Assembly symmetry: C3
Homo-oligomer: 488 residues x 3
């Protein structure tokens, strides 16, 4: 009769990494990194994005004639824009604090267009100006949200306007100033020189003067238009005054819905899907903690690390080979992790130990949960745009994002390596503990063989083996008989 | 004669958390997180703070008539401000580079006010102007550190002033420009249209032009006052020139004491107490590495982490139970950690090993220390203000702070969770090593029992027990009797 | 006949730090931190640096007469600039966006000077102005790269100029505006009052007006000169228009080479020496991965920490003392780490176990390589310059750099401590496993002496001792012989 102690081996070829060894085959493993996407830009939480197309943010807000599908847009979740949009300010010029406007848009989910200053109130001026830069079907045209005020007859009276914010929320207002090419066109348009444009609120004052100078021709014109914007608060008033060179607003953008949004720079097209996380390359449909697809991401998403493989060992080391546990593992054990093999006059067979296997199972489950359920609250790494005169700020942003990402990559990798090593040591210690427990309970009644086996000095029936398996072995009951067999 | 090897158990009911298990009851534990404060604002290192009350920095430095208690201010440790102060600028207007000034004030601990331009030197201008926005007992008044130059008779000559910095430190100078509402106001106040204000130092050049427009009424006036500040160096001269619309300074602020300070945004009041670390919720009196009261602290403070519990283990696992360490721990060996129980003819009592307990004690103490004093901090008077045109910078600062705090929280949790398991394995490994050493030194003269206890073959008195315990058991002397008793 | 299991010791005196104890002596150790430099400024990868001497970047780029050796500079790898340069703007004034220009220069490795506007094409003006603040041997002189335009007779026509970038790369163009001291000197230099300077490109448009005021005298003058710079793109045109107070450019700086360079604030001089890493204190020549010389480095460089020492344990714990591993190591086993000492009738000597020694060697080497090669990202800590109106941004940069620095230092120190502790535990576990293996194989034919050695009951020559050393021991062959003496 004999009883021997061993562990479980199977046909798995999964491999994990430790701090002392590389490419170690294990019975079970868990991958906590996601490396695949569907390659599609699709809807997030039911609300589709805002597909700008060839438009730009300024082109959409100002009302570019070639951008007219966005004159009334519903609620969105994120704004899809191209790297170098082709429909933009058609009239050459600039747009002050453009990146601040984009940052503000990164937290707005719906706009409502309110006619604050109608086009028919300017009864002392001409409001039908246009340029061949923003041409519609050949004939000249202009932006569809702005009014170009021009002299009516040989007179340009002082243009005055005002609006009180009785809409319910904060409003966004954009106006412009025209810089001509020569004095002749300034006289032919506004009839007066030394003009000014004044915009005023309770917290804002601004006065601008046109500047006339020959400039390199962009889009065929040497003139420019400079645009500015403001955020009018509730129950506040905005005042416009101008003696010339004013591009007045006709509409204002009320912030209806607010939340966490963003601007995604892609060249793709929206496709009918649904997801909870979105990256420029594609969407992510997972429950795993980590991913390595793309740093930029909108929505609740797994964290990002620059790694190729992050695999946690949850099973024993696969060393296929009766002897026991020192020689190698067993392929016949299909019930648990650690167990016994018994051979007596009534037969032979394998069996598993419930207590130790369960203790190790909960231990490994707790370890996996602790790694996953604490490695959350990582960084965000969301988009942000900077101008050509803010290079130091852009470098600071890049360095900060890169440093945090590197730190988290290091943390995850070292954690996984150390826990894999400790798990393997844990399993070895558990097998040794079972062997030592059985040896201590059996004492001198048996003989060790050196392979993890025990050979009895008496007869162990099936109930005797059940007793030794469940730790109720009666040493005196078989002592005296053994005292014969050993001595003979 | 039985010698059993065991470990100490008490009635402690404190729990640690390892990475393989949760809620492990432990004999002795050390909390390294502080969660309590006194809820009061106190003096830092014996120096009382500067209580601004309902006044803001601009109101204090400009001399608002209702902030007249702050005209002479002694040394301070930190400034206390309200979120939305209500004495800021009686005359509506703006303050240029306000956030930069507030950041400069975070490294200044005392100001000394010098008279740089006396009010009576303007012998060709009227210097008794005031507004009803800054009203005292109904009559109009003005800021106490500024002079409003107006016309004396029907003429406004060129106002010229200069000051050479012989005070002995860097000086802070604030001037202002008045923007009226209508042309009639400009004629009535300065008698000339098309005026300028020129301020010049050896580094700073500034020319400003008054601008006249109709504005929404704030505090009952449509006019504005724009204030600017400069930092004049030692032995440098400042020059003011104006043809109108100059609000001249009368006082300068010499930086008398420099140090590490800050601005703390609270709504409370100073109370009679003395502290060394101050948070917006209250003071901290602790000697621990971590805390979770508030991120923004001033003084010598521990590090902030978003962790609810952080408890290190210093003692054994509380497994209560004569047997040995196989069954559990002893509740009656209150002398140390690892020890021996014995039972011979002349007595039955416990004991405690000295060398092993001392080594474990020093190891645990060194581990706790190395965890604690590995963390090196500084004054860390964090806090920065940003304007409404600077939102990308605010987001950058917030993200950097959040990322660093998250990294440190993860580090602390990892360290505690790993060291807890390491210590809990250290203890039972030490117990097993003591058992193995005793067995090896005793050899075959004794009999194992499977519950951590050794039965003796010869009669062992107290001298032999002490020889076993100290490590000088004589196998040759007790050999023959042991063999005779064993062979039977 | 005896065999003993033990390990190896020597006379080394290297010390390491663990997490449970301090100042532990080891047999072998590896220092991974560099603390030495050559105290020299060398040539990076065969390209000598650009030594500005007592010059500033503005002085070099504008043509300061004292900085006449830099009128044609060759390729450079980095720029060397003093902390407080003495030769810079000879004419008092200011440079707009100076720090942005320095940041741009931090990635340019060669410049080419192209004549874009010659000095002989201003046929209607005077182009020989000068000042004594930029004197050359007493006589007045001006910047060598700029032209000062003054009236030819009592007439100042409109100055117009243009340049089309047909060079082949981006160009850098610098112009200036002159702010006089009095109206008399404005009339004696430009003949008209109320002048302007207009500069226009495809993306930039700017108009500036001179200001006339009396200012404190710097370098004997009360007038000032304000300089601005622009980056002209390929196939783009720049236009200059002026009615007075224009300091026109003559040369443009085409960017010939691009790469990774930098600016070093040092007070030294270049010396004939070569390196691949450079710091302001000296050069680094090493293969180790860490150093604690200076945060700011240029070239292929190691990583930087704030630690005083970092030593990795690649050997055993040195405990000198025939008995085995219970009492300590051996000094006669100079062949490997673990081994056996044997004593029979025909001799007695030491030996080594190749399998366990090789396994430990591989594990230690893999751990060390993992520690070294996982530090691949780290940080870089570039140098940036900020003006005195950007103190918040400067503090943000400093705080971020410091935070990352202590994060990485903490990581390195904790990793070293934990690796040292694990190595010293694993070395003892290996010897214990070897002893257990030999004991289990030899079974009951031997007696244990309690000090790591075994005494054979039978007689065993070298054949059987190399049989037990290589794990091939025949228990039945000596079973009866051992039983004969054991039962006696
Ligand atoms: C309205 C118009 O056709 N203007 C053209 C101008 O006209 C004269 C007319 O105004 C006057 O009463 O009588 C004389 C004859 O006695 C002329 O008939 O003549 C210019 C040439 O000398 C044309 O100049 C060219 O304009 C180009 C751009 O045209 C547009 C544009 O598409 O941008 C046409 C718009 O109608 C015009 N006006 C408005 C109110 O939008 C704008 C406007 O001039 C721009 O703001 C210019 O900065 O320009 C090119 O600029 C070309 O270089 C230029 O020679 C006028 O079109
Ligand atoms: C000194 C005074 O009371 N001036 C008021 C002005 O009176 C004239 C007189 O000075 C002139 O010689 O002759 C004319 C008649 O031809 C007047 O009799 O009359 C104005 C209206 O017609 C007043 O207008 C109102 O002023 C308000 C402001 O007064 C205060 C203020 O409360 O802030 C205080 C001072 O009276 C005034 N002057 C000075 C030197 O400080 C200042 C100042 O005017 C403004 O604050 C900035 O320009 O303001 C309100 O502004 C109200 O809206 C306005 O109608 C004159 O007060
Ligand atoms: C060319 C010259 O020497 N001009 C001096 C000027 O002379 C006048 C003369 O040019 C004119 O034709 O006739 C009248 C009489 O009808 C004068 O004789 O006289 C000024 C004082 O009366 C001098 O003033 C002093 O200039 C100093 C500066 O000299 C430099 C300098 O070192 O910066 C050099 C040149 O003279 C000049 N550069 C030119 C003209 O291209 C510059 C120029 O003034 C700059 O704009 C400096 O702001 O000045 C000192 O500035 C001293 O403080 C001042 O009194 C004229 O030098
Ligand atoms: C491994 O064995 C399992 C039986 O449990 C079988 O389903 C699986 O296909 C086998 N895989 C390989 C690669 O042999
Ligand atoms: C581990 O496997 C990878 C590929 O599977 C191989 O590139 C690498 O060399 C292997 N390393 C070892 C130590 O076997
Ligand atoms: C704007 O309208 C609100 C009511 O919606 C009113 O209380 C406020 O006085 C108005 N503003 C002005 C300047 O009249
Ligand atoms: C635990 O034992 C100690 C003995 O020193 C005793 O003072 C303490 O009160 C006990 N715990 C409780 C909760 O009573
Ligand atoms: C540990 O105790 C906490 C209460 O402090 C409880 O919420 C948690 O479920 C417990 N966990 C286990 C595994 O008992
Ligand atoms: C200011 O005073 C110092 C002496 O205190 C003197 O050296 C310096 O020249 C003065 N400044 C001017 C512009 O005169
Ligand atoms: C370790 O040795 C160094 C010698 O450089 C000594 O300064 C230090 O105090 C020692 N530490 C301990 C704990 O003995
Ligand atoms: C500048 O030169 C290029 C040829 O290199 C030409 O195509 C372009 O039209 C020129 N620019 C202007 C404004 O003429």
């Amino acid at each position: 009769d004999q009883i021997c102690i061993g562990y479980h081996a199977n046909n798995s070829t999964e491999k994990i990494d430790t701090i002392l060894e590389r490419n170690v085959t294990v019975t079970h493993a868990k991958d906590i990194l996601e490396k695949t996407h569907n390659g599609k830009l699709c809807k997030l939480n039911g609300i589709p994005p805002l597909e700008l197309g060839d438009c730009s943010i300024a082109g959409w807000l100002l009302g570019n004639p070639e951008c007219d599908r966005l004159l009334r847009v519903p609620e969105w979740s994120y704004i899809m824009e191209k790297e170098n949009p082709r429909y933009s300010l058609c009239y050459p010029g600039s747009f002050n604090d453009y990146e601040e406007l984009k940052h503000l848009l990164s937290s707005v989910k719906h706009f409502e267009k309110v006619k604050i200053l109608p086009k028919d109130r300017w009864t002392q001026h001409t409001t039908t100006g246009g340029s061949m830069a923003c041409a519609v079907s050949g004939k000249p045209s202009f932006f569809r949200n702005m009014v170009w005020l021009t002299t009516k007859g040989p007179n340009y009276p002082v243009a005055q306007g005002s609006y009180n914010n009785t809409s319910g929320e904060q409003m966004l207002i954009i106006w412009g100033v025209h810089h001509p090419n020569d004095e002749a066109e300034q006289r032919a348009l506004y009839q007066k020189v030394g003009t000014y444009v004044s915009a005023s609120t309770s917290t804002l004052y601004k006065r601008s003067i046109p500047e006339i100078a020959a400039r390199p021709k962009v889009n065929g014109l040497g003139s420019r238009m400079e645009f500015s914007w403001t955020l009018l608060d509730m129950w506040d008033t905005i005042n416009f005054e101008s003696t010339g060179n004013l591009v007045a607003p006709e509409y204002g953008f009320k912030i209806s819905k607010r939340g966490s949004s963003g601007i995604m720079k892609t060249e793709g097209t929206l496709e009918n899907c649904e997801t909870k996380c979105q990256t420029p390359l594609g969407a992510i449909n997972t429950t795993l903690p980590f991913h390595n697809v793309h740093p930029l991401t909108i929505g609740e998403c797994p964290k990002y690390v620059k790694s190729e493989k992050l695999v946690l060992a949850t099973g024993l080391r696969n060393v296929p080979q009766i002897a026991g546990f020192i020689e190698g593992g067993w392929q016949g054990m299909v019930d648990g992790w650690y167990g016994y093999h018994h051979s007596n006059d009534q037969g032979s067979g394998y069996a598993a130990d419930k207590e130790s296997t369960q203790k190790a199972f909960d231990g490994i489950t707790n370890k996996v949960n602790s790694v996953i359920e604490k490695m959350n609250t990582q960084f965000e790494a969301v988009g942000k745009e900077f101008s050509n005169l803010e290079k130091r700020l852009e470098n600071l942003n890049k360095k900060m994002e890169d440093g945090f990402l590197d730190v988290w990559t290091y943390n995850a990798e070292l954690l996984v390596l150390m826990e894999n090593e400790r798990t393997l040591d844990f399993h070895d210690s558990n097998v040794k503990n079972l062997y030592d427990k059985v040896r201590m309970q059996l004492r001198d009644n048996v003989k060790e063989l050196g392979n993890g086996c025990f050979e009895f000095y008496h007869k162990c029936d099936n109930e005797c083996m059940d007793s030794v398996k469940n730790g109720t072995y009666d040493y005196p009951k078989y002592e005296e008989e053994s005292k014969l067999n050993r001595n003979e």
